[PDB]
Amino acid sequence: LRDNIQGITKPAIRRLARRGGVKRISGLIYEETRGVLKVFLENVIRDAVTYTEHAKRKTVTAMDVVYALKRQGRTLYGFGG
Amino acid sequence: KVLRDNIQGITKPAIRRLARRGGVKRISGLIYEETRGVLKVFLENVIRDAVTYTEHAKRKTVTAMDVVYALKRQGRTLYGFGG
Amino acid sequence: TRAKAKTRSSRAGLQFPVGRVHRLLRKGNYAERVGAGAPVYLAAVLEYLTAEILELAGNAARDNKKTRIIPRHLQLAVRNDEELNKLLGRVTIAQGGVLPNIQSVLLPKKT
Amino acid sequence: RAKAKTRSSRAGLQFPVGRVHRLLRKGNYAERVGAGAPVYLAAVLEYLTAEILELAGNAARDNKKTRIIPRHLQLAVRNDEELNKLLGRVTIAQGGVLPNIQSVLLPK
Amino acid sequence: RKTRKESYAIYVYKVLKQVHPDTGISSKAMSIMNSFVNDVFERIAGEASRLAHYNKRSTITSREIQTAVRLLLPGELAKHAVSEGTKAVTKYTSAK
Amino acid sequence: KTRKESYAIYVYKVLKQVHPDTGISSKAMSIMNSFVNDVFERIAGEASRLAHYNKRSTITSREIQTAVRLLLPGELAKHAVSEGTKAVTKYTSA
Amino acid sequence: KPHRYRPGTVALREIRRYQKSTELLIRKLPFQRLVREIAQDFKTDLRFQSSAVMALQEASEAYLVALFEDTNLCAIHAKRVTIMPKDIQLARRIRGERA
Amino acid sequence: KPHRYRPGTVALREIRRYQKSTELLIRKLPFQRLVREIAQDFKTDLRFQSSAVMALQEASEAYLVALFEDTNLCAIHAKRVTIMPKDIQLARRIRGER
Ligand SMILES: [Cl-]
Ligand SMILES: [Cl-]
Ligand SMILES: [Cl-]
């Protein structure tokens, strides 16, 4: 239950960087990117779980993640709204 | 009288003082024109919103509350003049 | 009553519902009183923005030789327009990706 | 015929529960507004005001002053990490910035 | 089992047919347009409510929505939307 | 003249409760009043949004608690939830 | 006899291929495991809708693609074509996320 | 010849002096003229409270100081101590105002 951040693989971060337009990727990128992604997911899942707590539910709906991302100024379309 | 050429009123030493408060050691020469441009576009957006708030308030004097509401709306909340 | 029930959408020459907009302005807890010019005007604004974006998205569907607007076409429709980019710069559209943007220094020197 | 005990003193607080309550009513937030809501909210506001005025009195003491100026609020918020997270997109007037000098700009 | 979640889906489709009569739209893109309409709606009604609280008013009329549009839409998009809105409010106030 | 309300004397009261000898200027008083108004509007905003999300029309202490847990980062959230639950106990048992 | 390309050409080819595609680049199940792992430290026995994890993945990949865009601009600005954690830290610092 | 300092020492001295001070660095009256000039292209005969122009100046100087902070970080990142319009454009691009 600790190698789940390693599930964000080196090919997957490379594909993401290719979509971002990156030509060359140093080796120290990948651990840093796993870290930054983990911090972003910490903030988002923290807010979404807070919203789940307020609704007295046990499951996290997609509307909760939409409301969380909307609160954090990154509005997401296509999941209700 | 139509006011013109007031962007030059943001003088070179004032931009240098602003650079010093930002921690800048050395300043190239095109910084001053670029900075006058960026400050002009910033004041364009902010004064545009404040003028809009004046328009809807049926007034002709831009209050400090209008500029506070405008800066706050753009995600830069200014303390000291209300809100 | 004995009258033809002409809806406020058709009365204003619009398509978006003035009644649903009006009862969302009432239920949404924005003010005590909500007029009729407010939901008429707001349905007009929303119809115009929906019209312009679905227009640009049909254009990008035509360019992609398709007759069904996908998320990617909305993505291209918003991000290739400057003012829609200013409107939705802090907004993620799902299943859209990004624009095909490649910087000039990353290209090989084909001279 | 009863002693008019205010809800601030009833809740053991200082910020007015009545003014917070009528701003929650007037402010068009919901149809109904409780009493635990303005009590809790006055408590939160009093705690944040307490913490910031504490750090600001500390920065006034460090500056050998007994009157809190804007600069002292500036230092109180920006030298704390979580108050910086709270007010990252917030400008405090007459405050300036922190005395921050980068390491590579210093002479060797 | 009786719960109807409201949407703008038929109205987005009607405006699409009134713009591109031969071009359809998927349900994911319909959801994205629905959430865009809901979002812009909330933005304009938000700004209008804020303006009404600012100016010590309790009645949202077309003028509040108008200056909220002039604030929220960037420039020429705001000019076209204020024109389209004032045209529809003119047509509304002088109809059958 | 219509009285423009403020939190100024309450900021002075809490300042004496945290620094009995340290005063405060009027511009710093304006900055504290604006901070209090701002954070008030933030929490009441997020709480109104919370009530609207959950199809409710009553703002109770739970909506304000979840709003404070959203807006205040980490330890500010935990200490404000502690102080607020303390004051709501002190209110309901007085 | 075995053919081999230069690095830049397959790199640019992948840049084009993934800027044309729209599919999710992180796999679904390890991202789901990461989401459950991060959630675990907030409340035990949490459940997730499938569309919730899909929304998390859409926003996370879009966030990292905008991050790598800014990171590439930092690299190009520093007369490089190779991104570095220097560039990621500069990007996040200018965006205001260093907290 | 009289005494003359190195550039870095007076530069760092001014960096220290102005990061300690709190006063407005742009002068009041040319900023006021700039505000009236920009306002002129929105409505003729606009009036301004003094505290409104002071609020504009506080926010404008704070914005430009945060801009020069990000610009200095761009310069330092590019192995330079000189800020450039390259650095200003990179800062505004990453911040999202381009
Ligand atoms: Cl009206
Ligand atoms: Cl309650
Ligand atoms: Cl590095």
Curated annotation (Swiss-Prot), chain B:
The modification N6-butyryllysine is found at K12, K25, K58, K60, K72. Belongs to the histone H4 family. GO terms for biological process: nucleosome assembly. The modification N6,N6-dimethyllysine is found at K1. Core component of nucleosome. Nucleosomes wrap and compact DNA into chromatin, limiting DNA accessibility to the cellular machineries which require DNA as a template. Histones thereby play a central role in transcription regulation, DNA repair, DNA replication and chromosomal stability. DNA accessibility is regulated via a complex set of post-translational modifications of histones, also called histone code, and nucleosome remodeling. It comes from Xenopus laevis (African clawed frog). Keywords: Acetylation, Chromosome, Citrullination, DNA-binding, Hydroxylation, Isopeptide bond, Methylation, Nucleosome core, Nucleus, Phosphoprotein, Ubl conjugation. The modification N6-acetyllysine is found at K12, K40, K60, K72. It is found in: Nucleus; Chromosome. GO terms for cellular component: nucleosome; nucleus. It comes from the Eukaryota. The nucleosome is a histone octamer containing two molecules each of H2A, H2B, H3 and H4 assembled in one H3-H4 heterotetramer and two H2A-H2B heterodimers. The octamer wraps approximately 147 bp of DNA. The modification N6-methyllysine is found at K1. This is Histone H4. The lineage of its organism: Eukaryota, Metazoa, Chordata, Craniata, Vertebrata. The modification N6-glutaryllysine is found at K12, K40, K58, K60, K72. The keyword NAD does not apply. The modification Phosphotyrosine is found at Y32, Y69. The chain holds residues 21 to 103 of 103 of the full protein. The modification N6-methylated lysine is found at K1. The keyword Manganese does not apply. The modification N6,N6,N6-trimethyllysine is found at K1. The modification Phosphoserine is found at S28. There is a cross-link at K12 (Glycyl lysine isopeptide (Lys-Gly) (interchain with G-Cter in UFM1)).
Swiss-Prot record, chain D:
Residues 1-8 have a biased composition (Basic residues). The modification N5-methylglutamine is found at Q94. Following DNA double-strand breaks (DSBs), it is ubiquitinated through 'Lys-63' linkage of ubiquitin moieties, leading to the recruitment of repair proteins to sites of DNA damage. H2AK119Ub and ionizing radiation-induced 'Lys-63'-linked ubiquitination are distinct events. Glutamine methylation at Gln-94 (H2AQ104me) by FBL is specifically dedicated to polymerase I. It is present at 35S ribosomal DNA locus and impairs binding of the FACT complex. It is found in: Nucleus; Chromosome. It comes from the Eukaryota. Keywords: Acetylation, Chromosome, DNA-binding, Hydroxylation, Isopeptide bond, Methylation, Nucleosome core, Nucleus, Phosphoprotein, Ubl conjugation. The modification N6-(2-hydroxyisobutyryl)lysine is found at K26, K64, K65, K85, K108. GO terms for biological process: heterochromatin formation. Transmembrane segments: none annotated. The modification N6-succinyllysine is found at K85. GO terms for cellular component: nucleosome; nucleus. GO terms for molecular function: DNA binding; protein heterodimerization activity; structural constituent of chromatin. There is a cross-link at K3, K5 (Glycyl lysine isopeptide (Lys-Gly) (interchain with G-Cter in ubiquitin)). The modification N6-glutaryllysine is found at K85, K108. The nucleosome is a histone octamer containing two molecules each of H2A, H2B, H3 and H4 assembled in one H3-H4 heterotetramer and two H2A-H2B heterodimers. The octamer wraps approximately 147 bp of DNA. Belongs to the histone H2A family. This is Histone H2A type 1.
From Swiss-Prot, chain E:
One of its GO terms (molecular function) is protein heterodimerization activity. Glycans are attached at S83. Disulfide bonds: none annotated. There is a cross-link at K91 (Glycyl lysine isopeptide (Lys-Gly) (interchain with G-Cter in ubiquitin)). Monoubiquitination of Lys-91 by BRE1 gives a specific tag for epigenetic transcriptional activation and is also prerequisite for histone H3 'Lys-4' and 'Lys-79' methylation. GlcNAcylation at Ser-83 promotes monoubiquitination of Lys-91. It fluctuates in response to extracellular glucose, and associates with transcribed genes. Keywords: Acetylation, Chromosome, DNA-binding, Glycoprotein, Isopeptide bond, Nucleosome core, Nucleus, Phosphoprotein, Ubl conjugation. One of its GO terms (cellular component) is nucleosome. It comes from the Eukaryota. It is found in: Nucleus; Chromosome. Transmembrane segments: none annotated. Its main location: nucleus. The nucleosome is a histone octamer containing two molecules each of H2A, H2B, H3 and H4 assembled in one H3-H4 heterotetramer and two H2A-H2B heterodimers. The octamer wraps approximately 147 bp of DNA. Core component of nucleosome. Nucleosomes wrap and compact DNA into chromatin, limiting DNA accessibility to the cellular machineries which require DNA as a template. Histones thereby play a central role in transcription regulation, DNA repair, DNA replication and chromosomal stability. DNA accessibility is regulated via a complex set of post-translational modifications of histones, also called histone code, and nucleosome remodeling. Belongs to the histone H2B family. This is Histone H2B 1.1.
UniProtKB/Swiss-Prot annotation, chain H:
The modification N6-methyllysine is found at K1, K20, K28, K43, K86. Keywords: Acetylation, ADP-ribosylation, Chromosome, Citrullination, DNA-binding, Hydroxylation, Lipoprotein, Methylation, Nucleosome core, Nucleus, Palmitate, Phosphoprotein, Ubl conjugation. The modification Phosphoserine is found at S21, S50. This is Histone H3.2. Core component of nucleosome. Nucleosomes wrap and compact DNA into chromatin, limiting DNA accessibility to the cellular machineries which require DNA as a template. Histones thereby play a central role in transcription regulation, DNA repair, DNA replication and chromosomal stability. DNA accessibility is regulated via a complex set of post-translational modifications of histones, also called histone code, and nucleosome remodeling. The keyword Nucleotide-binding does not apply. The lineage of its organism: Eukaryota, Metazoa, Chordata, Craniata, Vertebrata. One of its GO terms (cellular component) is nucleoplasm. The modification N6-(2-hydroxyisobutyryl)lysine is found at K20, K28, K43, K86. The modification N6-succinyllysine is found at K20, K43, K86. The modification N6,N6,N6-trimethyllysine is found at K20, K43. The nucleosome is a histone octamer containing two molecules each of H2A, H2B, H3 and H4 assembled in one H3-H4 heterotetramer and two H2A-H2B heterodimers. The octamer wraps approximately 147 bp of DNA. A lipid is attached at C74 (S-palmitoyl cysteine). The modification N6-crotonyllysine is found at K20.
